Amino acid sequence: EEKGWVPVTKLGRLVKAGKISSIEEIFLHSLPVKEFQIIDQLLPNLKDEVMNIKPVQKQTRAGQRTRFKAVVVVGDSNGHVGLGIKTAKEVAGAIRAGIIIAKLSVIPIRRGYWGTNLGQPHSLATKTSGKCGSVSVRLIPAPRGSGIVASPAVKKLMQLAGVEDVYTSSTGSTRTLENTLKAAFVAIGNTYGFLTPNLWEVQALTPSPMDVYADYATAS
Amino acid sequence: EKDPKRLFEGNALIRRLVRIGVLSEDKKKLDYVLALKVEDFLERRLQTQVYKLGLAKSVHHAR
Amino acid sequence: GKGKPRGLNSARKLRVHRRNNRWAETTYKKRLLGTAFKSSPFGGSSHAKGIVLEKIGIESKQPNSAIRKCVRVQLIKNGKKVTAFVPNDGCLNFVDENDEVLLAGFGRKGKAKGDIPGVRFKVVKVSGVSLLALWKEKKEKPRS
Amino acid sequence: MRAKWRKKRTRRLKRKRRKVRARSK
Amino acid sequence: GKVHGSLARAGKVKSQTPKVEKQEKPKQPKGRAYKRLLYTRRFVNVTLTNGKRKMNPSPS
Amino acid sequence: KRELIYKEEGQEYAQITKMLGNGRVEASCFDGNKRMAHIRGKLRKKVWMGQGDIILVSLRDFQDDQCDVVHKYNLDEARTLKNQGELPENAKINE
RNA sequence: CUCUAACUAUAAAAAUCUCUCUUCUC
RNA sequence: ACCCACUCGGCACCUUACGAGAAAUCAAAGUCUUUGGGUUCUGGGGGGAGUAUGGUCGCAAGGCUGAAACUUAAAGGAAUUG
RNA sequence: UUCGGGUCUUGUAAUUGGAAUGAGUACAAUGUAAAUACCUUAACGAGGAACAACUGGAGGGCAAGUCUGGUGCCAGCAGCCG
Ligand SMILES: [Mg+2]
Ligand SMILES: [Mg+2]
Ligand SMILES: [Mg+2]
Ligand SMILES: [Mg+2]
Ligand SMILES: [Mg+2]
Ligand SMILES: [Mg+2]
Ligand SMILES: [Mg+2]
Ligand SMILES: [Mg+2]
Ligand SMILES: [Mg+2]
Ligand SMILES: [Mg+2]
Ligand SMILES: [Mg+2]
């Protein structure tokens, strides 16, 4: 675990300099991420749960050659989710690369209220859907304490989200796991991508961090 | 809110739950009574309350 | 779009649309045609007793290879003749042709199961006593 | 099989049975 | 040779199995005691934390 | 050279009358019968058969008419058998 | 920032095909 | 009669997804889980079979209407690699 | 330095003892039209506490064995794949 990490991708340089307080200043400005050490540094306690190691095959002139596709979901149960599907000949290498991919694609979500807002919102803020292949997933907010009503895979996704309660409904052939997980992840990520009526005010568009701190990037 | 059926049946529910004491005396709001985490109702079993009062010494004994 | 009748005063056409579309799924059609009684030697019955004629051994299907010990039987409640499988390995010797046998369903709602073709019926009780009891030697056939 | 010829066989059977019925009456 | 006996014996392997007799079998506790004992076995007398629970492990 | 298989009071030697499809065969059995036999597994596509051969066939003790092939003789063992007299010799088969 | 041209020409015959299909987490 | 520019209507075409689907692809096969413009008609796994019979029209071939008993764990779509 | 304290905690012997009571008995009464049955309750009434928990399953769906012995596409199992 040699934390050398020469910083490519100027943002990461800033992350090394400690000039980014949180990934908020990333997500607020839609800053792309390429190095997983950044998401390692900002969110300190990612937990991963590999969902499936699907064997995948191809036909050459001499027999069948096989890889494995790992579908691993990452999160911290505090409003940060990510999904990584990645394939490799070795299972361990596949799962490590999937961890990297999922860590890169971390997505923040909008935990809302079923009604009569109280401390620490429990459910989502809006019914939200997603689609992958024919897997069409739907998430409807839940009264507090109703728990996560979902399929095993979606249930693990929601627990990694930190949402303690949400109703789900999926149509299509959810027998496949990669499509179901991707669609549910897209749906949970669309929560912010939906104008919630408690947000009339148009903000003054605070300067981007890598703009105000472009000096410290690209160490000559 | 303030619906007389709501105000009466929900208040009776709170009264029963605080008479049994599964719900705390601060969370009497008809909203906290929606999440109980089934362990709480187990905690008010006779054997559990005996052991917390003593007399039990490895609950199965009390059982 | 969605080319089904949709006016506020279109109850009849849509209801009869359903009334005609329901004739496609098999369970509903079987239920109302009454074919569970004319066909299906079990007259809507979960169980029925019959008298054995002989002990035929039915050949398995293609990928499997075995010769499963079944038994023919003529039922009493309607008189029709049918085969029935004998589970629980040590029980063909328990058949004793010309003895009453209580047949039940065979796990596939009147359809042949797995690798045993031409038969859809289990065997649970023979000579009053249970095949499961006979196979594990908890009770014996009185041998009337 | 090619459904054209299966239908042709079926119609041949129809013709034979209709001729039999006509001879019966 | 190819077959020791005549095929289709209708319950063959039953007759040729070697019979064995139940040993003394100390009475396992049943009911509440069974649940207590199993819980003690699994989670407070924890045996393998090396990843898999792998309980009832094959002796090897 | 394998030793020929004898009959053990429950199987008998038969002459293939004709060849039937789907693993069936008609066997003139040397007991005064024209029985019907099946291709026992472990032999289906591992040992081929045909019209005009000699096969050991095991009879089903509960169902008489049907029986199953067990072992066939390769133009040497069956002639030996007819030499001892395990089989009636009135059935003459020579190419 | 002015542009609308070049071309070739073969069909002989050829049907059929047995087992045995199964194993990825650290 | 052409050239230009504009417009109305039809057979169509090209680029593209920002929408759609399973995908081939579609500028409609979009405006669909953010499910609702009006409407008729079709289908519920595949064989049996568009077959049996009953009608019904026809000189005739046959057309329309149209199942079951039973059997089966697949048939099928699209693209991918050999 | 051979050790070896067992320095920190777990179980393994499945041996040994101090307490408790029900299921069955059963004086009596209560219960009941009469009654048993229930609630009490005298005296009994547990060591292997023989006062003995069966029913299904252990490749996948699906918690749980790639331990042992036997059969060797036979016996069979298998709701589907096998
Ligand atoms: Mg056979
Ligand atoms: Mg159909
Ligand atoms: Mg057809
Ligand atoms: Mg007609
Ligand atoms: Mg195709
Ligand atoms: Mg007992
Ligand atoms: Mg058992
Ligand atoms: Mg077993
Ligand atoms: Mg398991
Ligand atoms: Mg073994
Ligand atoms: Mg079993």
Curated annotation (Swiss-Prot), chain F:
Signal peptide start-end: none
Domain S1-like: 1-74
GO biological process: formation of cytoplasmic translation initiation complex; formation of translation initiation ternary complex; formation of translation preinitiation complex; translation reinitiation; translational initiation
GO cellular component: cytoplasm; cytoplasmic stress granule; eukaryotic 43S preinitiation complex; eukaryotic 48S preinitiation complex
Keywords (A to Z) from UniProt: Initiation factor, Protein biosynthesis
GO molecular function: double-stranded RNA binding; protein kinase binding; ribosomal small subunit binding; translation initiation factor activity; translation initiation factor binding
Source superkingdom: Eukaryota
Functional note: Seems to be required for maximal rate of protein biosynthesis. Enhances ribosome dissociation into subunits and stabilizes the binding of the initiator Met-tRNA(I) to 40 S ribosomal subunits.
Family assignment from sequence similarity: Belongs to the eIF-1A family.
Note: Present with 35100 molecules/cell in log phase SD medium.
Protein name: Eukaryotic translation initiation factor 1A
Species assigned in the record: Saccharomyces cerevisiae (strain ATCC 204508 / S288c)
Range covered out of full length: 23 to 117 of 153
